Amino acid sequence: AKILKKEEEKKLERQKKLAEGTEIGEETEKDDAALVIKKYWRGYKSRKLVQ
Amino acid sequence: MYDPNTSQTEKQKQEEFLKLKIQEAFNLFVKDKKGIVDKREIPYIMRYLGQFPSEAQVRDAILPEIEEDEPSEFIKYSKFEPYMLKVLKEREYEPDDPEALLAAFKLLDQEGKGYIEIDMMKTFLEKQGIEFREQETKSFIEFATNKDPNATVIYYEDYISRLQAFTDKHIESVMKGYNNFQVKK
Amino acid sequence: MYDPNTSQTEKQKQEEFLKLKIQEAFNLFVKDKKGIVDKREIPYIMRYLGQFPSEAQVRDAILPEIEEDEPSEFIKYSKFEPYMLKVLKEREYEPDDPEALLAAFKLLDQEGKGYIEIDMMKTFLEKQGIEFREQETKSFIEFATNKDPNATVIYYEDYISRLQAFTDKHIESVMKGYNNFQVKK
Numbered sequence: 001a002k003i004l005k006k007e008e009e010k011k012l013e014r015q016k017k018l019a020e021g022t023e024i025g026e027e028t029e030k031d032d033a034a035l036v037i038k039k040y041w042r043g044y045k046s047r048k049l050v051q
Numbered sequence: 052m053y054d055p056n057t058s059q060t061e062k063q064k065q066e067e068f069l070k071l072k073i074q075e076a077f078n079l080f081v082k083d084k085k086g087i088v089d090k091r092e093i094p095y096i097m098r099y100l101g102q103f104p105s106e107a108q109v110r111d112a113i114l115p116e117i118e119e120d121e122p123s124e125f126i127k128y129s130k131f132e133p134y135m136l137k138v139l140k141e142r143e144y145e146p147d148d149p150e151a152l153l154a155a156f157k158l159l160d161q162e163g164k165g166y167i168e169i170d171m172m173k174t175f176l177e178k179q180g181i182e183f184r185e186q187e188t189k190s191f192i193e194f195a196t197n198k199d200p201n202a203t204v205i206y207y208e209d210y211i212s213r214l215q216a217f218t219d220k221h222i223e224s225v226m227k228g229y230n231n232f233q234v235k236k
Numbered sequence: 237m238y239d240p241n242t243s244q245t246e247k248q249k250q251e252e253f254l255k256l257k258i259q260e261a262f263n264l265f266v267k268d269k270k271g272i273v274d275k276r277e278i279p280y281i282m283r284y285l286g287q288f289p290s291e292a293q294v295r296d297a298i299l300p301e302i303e304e305d306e307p308s309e310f311i312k313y314s315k316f317e318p319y320m321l322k323v324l325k326e327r328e329y330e331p332d333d334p335e336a337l338l339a340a341f342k343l344l345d346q347e348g349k350g351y352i353e354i355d356m357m358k359t360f361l362e363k364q365g366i367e368f369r370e371q372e373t374k375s376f377i378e379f380a381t382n383k384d385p386n387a388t389v390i391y392y393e394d395y396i397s398r399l400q401a402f403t404d405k406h407i408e409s410v411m412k413g414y415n416n417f418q419v420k421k
Contacts (some may be wrong), residue, residue, distance in 0.1 A: 033155030046098030047221035
């Protein structure tokens with residue numbers, strides 16, 4: 001029930017934000033996610049090789 | 052690593068520790084002639100020391116800032132110490148928080164099923180941002196799947212948790228020694 | 237949770253934090269008008285306040301006390317917060333000692349083999365005492381067997397350990413912020 005209440009609150013907040021005509025780039029989000037994942041994977045490889 | 056909210060003595064000791072860790076990593080990654088290391092492992096040394104600079108960032112702001120005016124086929128401790136000393140002091144190449152990885156994985160999983168197809172993740176890795184090699188993608192699939200050969204999807208949450216724990220352990224390993232070094236009389 | 241042998245300032249701080257937590261739980265169960273919650277949700281809220289009252293106990297004692305002069309299908313926050321505060325301070329419906337649960341399970345396991353059959357547990361829960369509903373038994377079987385579809389028996393020790401760990405994590409999460417919470421003047 002608390003999770004559904006939080007979901008409703010977040011849905012209301014997102015609807016209010018969209019009512020302001022805010023455009024969020026979606027192509028760059030995937031690139032940022034890939035870059036972060038690659039950095040973390042390379043760091044994990046370095047650490048595993050270190051141990 | 053470096054705390055800029057400490058005393059002058061603390062800042063100096065942190066800098067000297069950065070210098071000595073740079074020296075340790077360089078010596079452990081010197082092959083034949085003491086005082087020289089290939090630039091390929093320079094990001095490898097940084098990862099050994101916790102820094103997470105991107106390949107483009109490493110090539111554009113790391114190597115030129117440490118390479119000589121005359122192109123030197125390998126880098127020596129001279130430009131290797133102060134560079135990442137200042138980087139750690141300013142935390143130039145600190146990786147994002149784990150929430151960044153969580154958001155990245157959620158974005159890659161548009162449907163939010165809790166896992167991402169191996170084919171899709173490999174497509175992102177080899178076609179978006181800094182592309183990985185085939186063997187790198189194989190290793191990523193192996194680890195994210197817990198070395199599962201027949202796995203088709205990966206639970207990004209468990210992988211993120213394991214990566215965070217391993218990063219914390221390696222950070223404990225590296226930081227151990229971050230502390231003492233004192234001005235010699 | 238609530239410490240009944242702390243300082244007077246600590247006593248007031250704990251009482252205020254418990255009142256705020258009860259108000260938050262009430263709001264979570266508020267659907268139409270603030271200050272009124274469904275009667276059926278009365279025991280459920282107690283389970284976040286650390287109380288695991290039985291259905292008979294709530295029906296015989298909790299309901300008549302919370303109910304006003306006349307029987308009402310909705311419980312007002314005015315009669316809910318004080319009763320909840322006193323119940324939590326007295327720890328009336330706190331879950332029993334995990335050792336008690338282990339003893340009960342071993343009593344169920346006559347041979348002491350460390351496991352109980354799913355059918356045996358279903359029969360015990362549906363024929364003796366306050367019989368569970370179908371969904372109650374389904375959830376208990378699923379989560380005791382760590383959501384294993386091929387599980388044939390339930391090991392009571394590890395299931396009890398997991399349930400206790402989950403309860404402790406939930407209690408700490410619900411208690412989160414007590415250190416930063418301060419008495420309102």
